């Protein structure tokens, strides 16, 4: 399925080249511009564990997830991955635990040492 395909065929987008964050572009977005550090970014996402269990979806809440990019407001894989996206882009992101919740996890849904899969759609970005 999609998690196997990004694991086996994804692009390593880490600066370290450590395979910690892998990406496949699923829907090509608009033009060339990507968001910059400090931009307010609006996204929709769904996330799943390596055991196949869904853990969250913004679509199910009928509102986007909003954060400021590159400020450590989200897990490392998301600051790294969203920074690569064009407006309107949908991608798949595989996140090894060192770029996600590590050995701690996030109770109750995320266990220790968890590799995470996300589908992410970048809706918009703007400077404040
Ligand atoms: C079950 C996983 C998780 C549980 C908390 C709510 C969100 C959650 O359901 C989830 O799907 C998730 O795993 N997210 C939410 C969408 C962005 C990616 C990821 C996330 O980063 O959530 C953070 C969790 C807290 C956090 C922030 C920064 C960290 O490192 C710098 C970090 O490391 C372990 C952990 C989150 C949750 C809620 C809001 C967030 O930012 C916007 C805001 O603060 O209003 C961010």
- The residues spanned by each domain of the chain are 1-128
**Residue given tokens 């996330």 in the structure block:** 47
Name which residue sits closest to atom 30 of ligand 1, judged by CA. Answer: 75
Q: List the catalytic residues.
A: 45, 55-56, 75, 101, 118
Q: Are 47 and 57 in contact (CB under 8 A)?
A: yes
Find the length of the chain.
128
**Correct CATH for 1-128 of 3.10.20.30, 3.50.50.60, 3.30.450.20, 3.10.50.40:** 3.10.50.40
Query: What's the 120 CA to ligand 1 centre distance in angstroms?
Result: 14
CB 65 within 8 A of CB 75: no
Q: Which residues have CB under 8 Å from 74's CB, separation 6+? A: 67, 82
Distance 41 CA to ligand 1 centre (A): 14
Q: Atom 7, ligand 1: which residue's CA is nearest?
A: 56
Residues with CB under 6 A from ligand 1: 45, 47, 55-56, 65, 67, 72-75, 78, 101, 106, 109-110
Three-state SS across the chain?
A: CHHHHHHHHCEECCCCCCCCEEEEEEECCCCCCCCCCCCEEEEEEEEEECCCCEEEECHHHCCCEEEECCCCCCCHHHHHHHCCCCCCCEEEEEECHHHCCCCCCECCCECCCCCEEEEEEEEEEECC
Q: Which residue among 74, 82, 99 is best mutated to probe the pocket of ligand 1, counting the most ligand atoms within 8 A of its Cβ?
A: 74
- Residue 6, φ and ψ in degrees, nearest 5: -70, -30
Tell me which method was used to determine the 3D structure.
X-ray
């Amino acid at each position: 399925g999609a998690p196997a395909t990004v694991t086996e065929q994804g692009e390593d987008i880490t600066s370290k080249k450590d395979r910690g964050v892998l990406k496949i572009v699923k829907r090509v977005g608009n033009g060339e511009e990507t968001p910059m550090i400090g931009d307010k970014v609006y996204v929709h996402y769904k996330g799943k564990l390596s055991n196949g269990k869904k853990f969250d979806s913004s679509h199910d809440r009928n509102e986007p997830f909003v954060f400021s990019l590159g400020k450590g407001q989200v897990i490392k894989a998301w600051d790294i991955g969203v920074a690569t996206m064009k407006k309107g882009e949908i991608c798949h992101l595989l996140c090894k635990p060192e770029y996600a919740y590590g050995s701690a996890g996030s109770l109750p849904k995320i266990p220790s040492n968890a590799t995470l899969f996300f589908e992410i759609e970048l809706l918009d970005f703007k400077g404040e």
